[PDB]
Design a protein around this ligand. Sequence first.
Ligand SMILES: Nc1nc2c(ncn2[C@@H]2O[C@H](COP(=O)(O)OP(=O)(O)OP(=O)(O)O)[C@@H](O)[C@H]2O)c(=O)[nH]1
Ligand SMILES: [Mg+2]
Lengths: 430, 46
Amino acid sequence: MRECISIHVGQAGVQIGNACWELYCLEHGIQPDGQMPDSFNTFFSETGAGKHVPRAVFVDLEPTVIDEVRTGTYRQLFHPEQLITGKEDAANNYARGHYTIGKEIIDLVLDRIRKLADQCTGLQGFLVFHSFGGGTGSGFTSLLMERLSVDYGKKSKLEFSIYPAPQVSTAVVEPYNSILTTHTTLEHSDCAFMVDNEAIYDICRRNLDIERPTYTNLNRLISQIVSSITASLRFDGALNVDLTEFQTNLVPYPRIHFPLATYAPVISAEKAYHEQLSVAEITNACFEPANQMVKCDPRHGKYMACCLLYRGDVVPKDVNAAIATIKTKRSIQFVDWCPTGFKVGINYQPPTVVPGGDLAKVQRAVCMLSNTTAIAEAWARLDHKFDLMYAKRAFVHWYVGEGMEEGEFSEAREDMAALEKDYEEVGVDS
Amino acid sequence: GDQRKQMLQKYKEEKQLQKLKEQREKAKRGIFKVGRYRPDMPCFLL
Ligand SMILES: Nc1nc2c(ncn2[C@@H]2O[C@H](COP(=O)(O)OP(=O)(O)OP(=O)(O)O)[C@@H](O)[C@H]2O)c(=O)[nH]1
Ligand SMILES: [Mg+2]
């Protein structure tokens, strides 16, 4: 049992999935062609004799990235009809991915997910990888999440995403897509993790001292985070973190389900020898504003619940010591209505190293997911960008052309402002 | 000689005034520039 289904929507999701599946194949020992020369049941199936098929699905409205997968070294891993492909890209348009182009591919992905979930007896949740800016990763992810909610229901729906950066962004119509997708993410996703590309670049520049990091390094870090998330399902440890109890401990209110991922230690090879990577120091480094994986300052916010996913050579004693030291620190501030705000999971499997990766071999690793109030700042700045572009009605006709109304933008903005008001209300003490 | 130095001071004042006017006109719209990033310093707990 303990099965999970991975969904990768858009280019960002497909490439992050390539990183994640290379990582899992390295972890469980499965060769790229699907043979091992137990614990893979969480992510891999069994087909006849010595075949491990990943429990994933690759959906994108343009063929380029999926055809990279179909021709790359992992072409034997997936069965051909698992990788789903449209004809025309959503073209950075929420409307195209949600109404016009996305409607001719949704039945096929839905029954593919149905058949993929029929093979597993202990399905726990879906991992949906997408981006908040692209037309596909916004619109089609919204459509898929609402169909999965009306179809599957009580199953958890974990969601990994690439939030647009405050400054360094690669799309012009990005805030529109982000607001439109969050208007449906607020209700159709049980726990949506936030990752920003700018923060990955900053982490790679400072810690991993890479002058020129590409998307493959970003996806490698994100894959490490997801592997740390699912290690409890895929391995054993002193304290196990199932997806359901993770969601229960991390989400205090139904609309507040946007925690911040962060991973530690992230270091270069040459920097690793001179560091005594103890549990206390990586636990401290998880709270460091420079090591945050989304460009927002936790100091301006107050934590509400943070889950600690230790893995490697970790004993609960020093975890308790580190948590106490954090509790004593005044810079890290917690809400008064959460006297205990740490969910702890210690695993036995150390984080593996992908060949050719930029991360050093480490005995211990921590993946913190803190549901802080600092994300209200990034959300409010995205709202400011949306308001600027919407006062002049710029780019709106590109959405009204194929299935949108002005009322959709107004509703999305009102819902997002309500979300900000909710975060402000839960921030203030009593 | 006093008249000559008074005229000298007046000339210097006029030159300074026109130079400042040109600087004010230039500063309204800077010229297009492009370089490297100069990343911001990371913030630390303090
Ligand atoms: N971290 C990371 N982000 C990516 C990667 N590839 C694309 N993105 C992000 O995706 C965002 C835009 O969406 P895309 O994935 O490019 O496009 P899409 O999701 O396929 O949707 P369309 O634009 O309609 O094609 C950009 O802001 C990128 O930050 C990647 O490999 N790694
Ligand atoms: Mg695309």
